[PDB]
Design a protein around this ligand. Structure first.
Ligand SMILES: [Mg+2]
Ligand SMILES: [Mg+2]
Ligand SMILES: [Mg+2]
Ligand SMILES: [Mg+2]
Ligand SMILES: [Mg+2]
Ligand SMILES: [Mg+2]
Ligand SMILES: [Mg+2]
Ligand SMILES: [Mg+2]
Ligand SMILES: [Mg+2]
Ligand SMILES: [Mg+2]
Ligand SMILES: [Mg+2]
Ligand SMILES: [Mg+2]
Ligand SMILES: [Mg+2]
Ligand SMILES: [Mg+2]
Ligand SMILES: [Mg+2]
Ligand SMILES: [Mg+2]
Ligand SMILES: [Mg+2]
Ligand SMILES: [Mg+2]
Ligand SMILES: [Mg+2]
Ligand SMILES: [Mg+2]
Ligand SMILES: [Mg+2]
Ligand SMILES: [Mg+2]
Ligand SMILES: [Mg+2]
Lengths: 199, 187, 133, 233
RNA sequence: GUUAUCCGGAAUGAUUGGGCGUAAAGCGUCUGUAGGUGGCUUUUUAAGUCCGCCGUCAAAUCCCAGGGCUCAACCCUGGACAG
């Protein structure tokens, strides 16, 4: 139920995908055969957008679909609510807090019971995080070592204003609900919403 | 009076030859053309089948300005181009709301093409079929419901869409027509 | 003349589409009230009454041509709703509103004729005579 | 600014009458006036307001620096047009009017290019060095090109104000300006529809006198507007 | 994935939402019974119609707001538009 396949590859075809890979793609070397499909059918544009989303967060389709139903339900602007929902996933928050290298990494971190949300172990990636929530490492040697090395050796200080990080114990804190401008990717949710008119 | 030869050679040098001056200026007009349909229509002659290409193309800025045009030639390329040029001289403006959608619900009729547009909440995107959707999208309408009832001809549906969004009245104007303040009609 | 209301409406629609400012209609409590209302909404220039051989005629002046007769962006639409065949009524929470409120809906209610606006203020439903664009 | 018109002069030149009552367009019934002996009589109080607004827009247009065409192709109006244009120093069409003069500009203007070469040829006297067939041929080209290009032969670029006589016969002028985004200021008799012109002046068709009156008032406005644009640029 | 079943798309049985000169479609033409609809003005009544209040339309389900199984599915509490 997880994408274990070649990553660079999906990246060449989709675009830039942070939650997947930090290695910038090869020059692309397709300039020999110069093979194109011509251009893309409007359908293919829509499809590639959705795929962008899906692989950035490591979600399965059947899951994405149910997020979208939750989205159409919710009273509000649909694409926005969707992006909220996807961006509140525990593993993704674990990632954007620099507590992980990438999303498969963060996911693994959560799975192996190395993380705590308000003094309780949550081992499932898709646990939805709500405002005022404590993201901690379990107090064991291993957990702490992991989080420390992956947090410190990665310099990025981009923290998106709803996310606090605190230094020695390493208490991360979820402050509030995401803003559409603070979202974790370049995507027109409009296209995805459109793709999903038929479900 | 200056001499006839140098002034007529001035209007001759200012109207430039079409055999010494190549053509690409079009991205300077701030537009984008979208080929909706390419078909091979045929005239028939004693020799045989004489093949032409019809192009149905719509132009917009994606900023609230759109038009349709149709063209015919031997090669895809030239048809496409004439289509562009024709649309550019047929063009109109679509009334928009602060959220990028339609003022109101509207139908439209052209030939056997009937068209129904109604405004949508922001965040629903543009959901429609081929002609209607490319025209809408190229106008820059962000959120709209549309369905074409009646026929399916790509072309008549394009025209129809245009007649729809042409007859769209914006509130300031109905307030100007009726002679009544805005806040009164809002209620 | 099976329906009188529909007929007034029609005389307008027709005289309108033919670019005439002046219409003769036959008066009635209903007719008169509807036209009054049409004036206070502002869809029509001016009304007046005439009498001959015990017949009453409301002549209606109509909004002038739109910056010529050939180039008209706007027409003035009318549509019958409750008609002798099927009478349509609505409670307070189904009261129609036309093109987000740009147009108007005429209602006959217990308090007399009005628009949908009035019906919402006073909290009343009733029989829906017609719509106007 | 004021213009020269009074009920007495309009009476004098004979503007107020128009074609028989079997020939009429009821489209003009809104502003017609009376009907006498099977001949229609048109409102002059409407005629004066239209003629004033016509001369006023003509004045603003000349003063800003815009360019003028005039058109009528009748036999008498053609003789009055060459002189109207010369007195106002404008462009004219009197002789046979060619479909496409306005709308199809590109080809029209190439036809102007070759007309200019013909005009240099003729005055150079290099038409004396030819066979007789060549000279009579070059002279066909000349005869035509004079009929068609004579009054416009100065104008380069698209004309943005067009004036016209008797829109009944002139259908294509009206069509082409309708198409190209050009104003028409036009003479209406009892037979013509007031759709086709931007400003349409109730007027007379059959009378050389009416043509002379209204065209002279108009060319006087073009001339005073010509002094004001000779001043402003 | 394939097959079966049902609704959709189908405005293709159409109240919302189609048609009948030539495309499927106006009885060969009238007279007329039931039935449907029917001009204007005042009054009455209040059957429709409208507004308020009450009773009920079991619980579960669907919808909204919280809570519990680490999450979700699922369970539990409270409440309500329709009609
Ligand atoms: Mg599964
Ligand atoms: Mg594979
Ligand atoms: Mg477990
Ligand atoms: Mg669906
Ligand atoms: Mg039709
Ligand atoms: Mg369809
Ligand atoms: Mg009811
Ligand atoms: Mg159906
Ligand atoms: Mg029906
Ligand atoms: Mg059918
Ligand atoms: Mg047959
Ligand atoms: Mg048949
Ligand atoms: Mg028959
Ligand atoms: Mg029979
Ligand atoms: Mg009978
Ligand atoms: Mg009977
Ligand atoms: Mg009865
Ligand atoms: Mg009655
Ligand atoms: Mg129940
Ligand atoms: Mg809930
Ligand atoms: Mg819970
Ligand atoms: Mg319950
Ligand atoms: Mg109830």
């Amino acid at each position: 139920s997880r994408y274990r396949g070649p990553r660079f590859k999906k990246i060449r075809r989709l675009g830039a995908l942070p939650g997947l890979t930090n290695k910038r793609p090869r020059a692309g070397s397709d300039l020999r055969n110069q093979s194109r499909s011509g251009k893309r059918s409007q359908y293919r544009i829509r499809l590639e957008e959705k795929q962008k989303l899906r692989f950035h967060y490591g979600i399965t389709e059947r899951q994405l679909l149910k997020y979208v139903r939750i989205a159409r339900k919710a009273k509000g602007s649909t694409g926005q609510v969707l992006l909220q929902l996807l961006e509140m996933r525990l593993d993704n928050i674990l990632f954007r807090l620099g507590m992980a290298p990438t999303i498969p990494g963060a996911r693994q971190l959560v799975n192996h019971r190395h993380i705590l949300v308000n003094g309780r172990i949550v081992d499932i990636p898709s646990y939805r995080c709500k405002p005022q929530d404590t993201i901690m490492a379990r107090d064991e040697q291993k957990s702490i070592a992991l989080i420390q090395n992956s947090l410190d050796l990665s310099p990025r200080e981009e923290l998106p204003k709803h996310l606090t990080l605190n230094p020695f114990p390493y208490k991360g804190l979820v402050n509030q609900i995401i803003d559409s401008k603070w979202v974790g990717l370049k995507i027109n949710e409009l296209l995805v919403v459109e793709y999903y008119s038929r479900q | 009076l200056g001499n006839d030869v140098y002034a007529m050679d001035s209007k001759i040098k200012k109207a430039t030859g079409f055999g010494s001056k190549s053509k690409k200026e079009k991205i300077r007009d701030g537009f984008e053309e979208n080929v909706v349909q390419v078909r091979r229509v045929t005239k028939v002659v004693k020799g045989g089948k004489h093949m032409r290409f019809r192009a149905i193309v719509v132009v917009g800025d994606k900023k609230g300005q759109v038009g349709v045009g149709v063209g015919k030639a031997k090669e895809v390329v030239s048809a496409v181009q004439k289509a562009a040029v024709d649309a550019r001289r047929n063009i109109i403006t679509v009334p928009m709301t602060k959220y990028l959608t339609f003022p109101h619900r509207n139908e439209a009729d052209y030939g056997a093409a009937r068209v129904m547009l109604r405004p949508a909440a922001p965040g629903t995107g543009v959901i429609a079929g081929g002609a209607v959707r490319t025209v809408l999208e190229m106008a820059g309408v962000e959120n709209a419901l549309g369905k074409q009832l009646g026929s399916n001809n790509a072309l008549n549906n394009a025209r129809a869409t245009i007649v729809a969004v042409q007859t769209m009245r914006q509130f300031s104007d109905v307030a100007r027509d009726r002679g009544i303040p805005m806040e009164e009609l809002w209620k | 003349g099976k329906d009188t209301i529909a007929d007034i409406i029609t005389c307008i629609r027709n005289a309108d589409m033919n670019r005439k400012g002046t219409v003769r209609i036959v008066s009635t409590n209903i007719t008169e009230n509807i036209v009054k209302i049409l004036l206070r909404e502002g869809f029509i220039e001016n009304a007046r009454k005439h009498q001959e051989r015990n017949k009453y005629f409301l002549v209606l002046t109509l909004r002038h041509r739109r910056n010529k007769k050939g180039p008209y962006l706007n027409t003035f639409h009318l549509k019958r709703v409750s008609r002798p065949g099927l009478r349509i009524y609505s409670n307070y929470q189904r009261i129609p509103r036309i093109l987000g409120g740009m147009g108007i809906a005429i209602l006959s209610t217990s308090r007399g004729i009005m628009t949908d606006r009035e019906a919402r203020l006073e909290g009343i439903g009733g029989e829906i005579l017609c719509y106007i664009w | 600014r004021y213009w020269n018109i009074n009920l007495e002069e309009m009476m004098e030149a004979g503007v107020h009458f128009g074609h028989g009552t079997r020939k009429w367009n009821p489209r003009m019934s809104p502003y017609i006036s009376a009907k006498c002996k099977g001949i229609h009589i048109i409102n002059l109080t409407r005629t004066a307001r239209f003629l004033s607004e016509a001369c006023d827009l003509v004045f603003d247009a000349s003063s800003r620096g815009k360019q003028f065409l005039i058109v009528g192709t009748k036999n008498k109006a053609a003789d009055s047009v060459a002189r109207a244009a010369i007195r106002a120093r404008c462009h004219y069409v009197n002789k046979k009017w060619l479909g496409g003069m306005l709308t199809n500009w590109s080809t029209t203007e190439t036809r102007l290019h070759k007309f200019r070469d013909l005009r240099m040829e003729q005055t150079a006297g290099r038409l004396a060095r030819l066979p007789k067939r060549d000279a009579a041929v070059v002279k066909r080209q000349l005869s035509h090109l004079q009929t068609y290009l004579g009054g416009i032969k100065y104008m380069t670029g698209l004309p943005d104000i067009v004036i016209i006589v008797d829109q009944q016969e002139e259908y294509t002028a009206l069509r082409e300006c309708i198409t190209l985004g050009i104003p028409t200021i036009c003479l209406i008799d009892t037979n013509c529809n007031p759709d086709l012109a931007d400003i349409s002046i109730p007027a007379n068709d059959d009378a050389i006198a009416s043509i002379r009156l209204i065209l002279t008032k108009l060319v006087f406005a073009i001339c005073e507007g010509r002094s004001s644009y000779i001043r402003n640029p």
